[PDB]
UniProtKB/Swiss-Prot annotation:
This is Bromodomain-containing protein 1. Transmembrane segments: none annotated. Highly expressed in testis. Scaffold subunit of various histone acetyltransferase (HAT) complexes, such as the MOZ/MORF and HBO1 complexes, that acts as a regulator of hematopoiesis. Plays a key role in HBO1 complex by directing KAT7/HBO1 specificity towards histone H3 'Lys-14' acetylation (H3K14ac), thereby promoting erythroid differentiation. It is found in: Nucleus; Chromosome. Residues 9-113 form the Bromo domain. The chain holds residues 555 to 674 of 1058 of the full protein. Component of some HBO1 complex composed of KAT7/HBO1, MEAF6, ING4 and BRD1/BRPF2. Component of the MOZ/MORF complex composed at least of ING5, KAT6A, KAT6B, MEAF6 and one of BRPF1, BRD1/BRPF2 and BRPF3. Interacts (via PHD-type zinc finger domain) with unmodified histone H3. Interacts (via PWWP domain) with dimethylated and trimethylated 'Lys-79' on histone H3. There is a cross-link at residue 41 (Glycyl lysine isopeptide (Lys-Gly) (interchain with G-Cter in SUMO2)). It comes from Homo sapiens.
Length: 121
């Protein structure tokens, strides 16, 4: 149908916007601490601690399959990256600290994204 196509154009444009959002968030991680999944070869107990691992490469795969229906779903995954880190790692670690700074800097990007998503529909 013509509607299904209209819908698909909306999702494509959301994917376009979320791709730019993801790039902006990932720039706030210059150390690349959150770029890839925590290695289960190197942290073999990880899944005993963290039940839903997340990282920026995994988000990108979902994004490019148009697997984010709305900004809320995308934010859920970003928040997992941060919250997983802040639980696994102690406060006095470079990893925890990196997550705090990513959360703080990301907030600004995500604030305007929400306005853009509501604004453009």
């Amino acid at each position: 149908s013509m509607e299904q196509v209209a819908m698909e154009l909306r999702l494509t444009e959301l994917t376009r916007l979320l791709r730019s959002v993801l790039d902006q968030l990932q720039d706030k991680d210059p150390a690349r601490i959150f770029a890839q999944p925590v290695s289960l070869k190197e942290v073999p107990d990880y899944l005993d601690h963290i039940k839903h691992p997340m990282d920026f490469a995994t988000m990108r795969k979902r994004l490019e399959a148009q697997g984010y229906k709305n900004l809320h779903e995308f934010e859920e995954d970003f928040d997992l990256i941060i919250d997983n880190c802040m639980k696994y790692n102690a406060r006095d670690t470079v990893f925890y600290r990196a997550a705090v700074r990513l959360r703080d800097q990301g907030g600004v990007v995500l604030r305007q994204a929400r306005r853009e998503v509501d604004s453009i529909g």
